[PDB]
Amino acid sequence: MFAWWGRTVYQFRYIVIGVMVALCLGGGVYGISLGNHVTQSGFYDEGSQSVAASLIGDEVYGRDRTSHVVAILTPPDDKKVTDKAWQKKVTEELDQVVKDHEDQIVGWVGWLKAPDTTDPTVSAMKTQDLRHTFISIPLQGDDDDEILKNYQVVEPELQQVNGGDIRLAGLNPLASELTGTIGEDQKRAEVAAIPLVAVVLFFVFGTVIAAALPAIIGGLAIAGALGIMRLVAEFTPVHFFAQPVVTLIGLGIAIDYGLFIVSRFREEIAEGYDTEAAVRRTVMTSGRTVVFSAVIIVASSVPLLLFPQGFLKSITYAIIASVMLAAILSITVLAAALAILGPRVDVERGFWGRLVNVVMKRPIAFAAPILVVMVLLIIPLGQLSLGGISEKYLPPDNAVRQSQEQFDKLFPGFRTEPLTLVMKREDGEPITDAQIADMRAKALTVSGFTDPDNDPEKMWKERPANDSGSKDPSVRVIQNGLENRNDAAKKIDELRALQPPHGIEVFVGGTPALEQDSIHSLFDKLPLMALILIVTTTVLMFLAFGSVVLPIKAALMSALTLGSTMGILTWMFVDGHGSGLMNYTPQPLMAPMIGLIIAVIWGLSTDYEVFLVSRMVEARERGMSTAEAIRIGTATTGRLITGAALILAVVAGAFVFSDLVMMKYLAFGLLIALLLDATIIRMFLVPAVMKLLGDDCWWAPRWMKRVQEKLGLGETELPDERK
């Protein structure tokens, strides 16, 4: 069935070439600016009561703008801040700041407007010696993205304050820095990635043009992917982390597929076959396999849609679009372009073959210990943690992280993240707060709460209610600080165990509650994720091939390898060994990051496996027994897998240098996992265990063989192609 597609591609090439080149070149200018529709929200679960309750409380009261940006002020030099000159100069510069722009900011809340006040809340707003003070200010807007953009617009003028200086931090500055690092990270990515891959693949494919094919293919594939994401941005927003993920993963898989096809065609044309039937051959035995790789890798990540996180949904859409577009463009246009290219395209393989044969003659021992060694690498994991995204992620040399540390060092206890207890009146009958007192006592009798004055009457009062909210008998929420955040986990359960008497409901929110509800929702759909992923991957492996037992055992082996490499990366990060090596603080992990990395590495490792099996199944179907087939297959697939692994390792280590620690986590984990899977799997033990299994390993359901060889994608046998 695939030969007909190859020959009709051969027939009329200009139409497809023009259509695809024009589509990708237009998508490039279409998506020049995709950061217009990127967001930093949607990380959590809507099905959780925490997020919905917090949002309803916010819309009924209005945003608490007190923590957008806060800047600590440093005086001229050595004159105390209790007299006129310092206050006049700093307030005059602040007047400059509010005077230059009005459409951007609301108003600077500070000790200086009313220095001669005795309110303890603003009295503790100064140090004991009173030389370090700060100024709070929000930004104009309603959602976090537009106020972040406003900050990005007007930050440097706030930077320039003082004949000394000012250090500003808070909720908005750290977010702005950690979002804006991505552009420079991507720039560094191509700058430090293109030369190495270019030189290695030039020294591999010989001439300049053969190195020009896959780089162009990857660039156009990622441009089309970003264009498709820009089109998708019409309805559902995407996270800003999607852009680097696509920009590198599409490039890597596209380079691998370009090698995948060009190295096969070159050996096809060295035999001297006819060029039309040559590109036919490249389509039938390589295009079918690359379609298998594409469909399996896209199907590996789609079960993540069961996790309702906008981050996960966005990145899965990104991966799907990027990889499938790359593969379809490859199989459609590369054969035609190579046919137009023409015939004049103008010691390691030997020892690979010798090594694999000598090993496989009796690798019994050389098979069994090895697989159990990494088994022990299971025990480093199991101490999984929960920290989400925090600020100690950023490097110590960063100005913002040290500024925020200086802020909460020289000013203790000024900012705390509360947990809200929202009480929305379904009955629409106005509240009496005697029930509120009853409930606060009811939840006070359980331990684990802070108290600033050893008197219970000083905790759990209403949150600030600016005029933007609905002044109605709707909600009287109560907030409290933290003793220690993780203990609140237990509280969560009992925080829903109590009762409002008759008709008023009660929901529980707050940032730890949002984080923990998200992680609990993730754990809720954990077993379905893994089981459906593995069963569908194995079945689709068999659907690609003529056997099921070898693919399912290979997938289980890949599961063990995934567990081992995830344990290794946990030892790298959660254990903290290597913290000084990579200049990162050992901190707990993220909620969906682990699932993302395990899914993607399952996909990549099973891709490498698919062609390894394909070469060996092609070798077996040529007509030879187990020994000759596997002997000719292992080294032949290894010569390509080594180059692919080197390419992917370079393009991944391009991202072990991004200051954001989670992106380092992703890159380092995926690269070590892909290397430890590819090299070790097809180097030592896996063909060994396959050959110990033997000739019976090539059985499959004939009742399913019926559909397999009649759907048009089980084209293994070849019609004795002429020479």
Author numbering: 1 to 346, 385 to 761
Sentences from the paper on this structure:
We then reconstituted the delipidated, purified MmpL3 transporter into lipidic nanodiscs. The structure of MmpL3-ND was solved using single-particle cryo-EM. The reconstituted sample led to a cryo-EM map at a nominal resolution of 3.65 Å. Density modification allowed us to improve the resolution of the map to 3.00 Å. The cryo-EM structure of MmpL3-ND indicates a monomeric molecule that spans the inner membrane and protrudes into the periplasm. Overall, the conformation of the cryo-EM structure of MmpL3-ND is comparable to that of the X-ray structure of MmpL3773-PE, although there are some conformational differences between these 2 structures. The conformation of MmpL3-ND is distinct in that the gap between subdomains PD1 and PD2 is larger when compared with that of MmpL3773-PE. The volume of the periplasmic central cavity formed between PD1 and PD2 was measured to be 1,794 Å3 in MmpL3-ND. Based on the structural information, the increased volume of the periplasmic central cavity of MmpL3-ND is in part caused by the increased separation of PD1 and PD2.
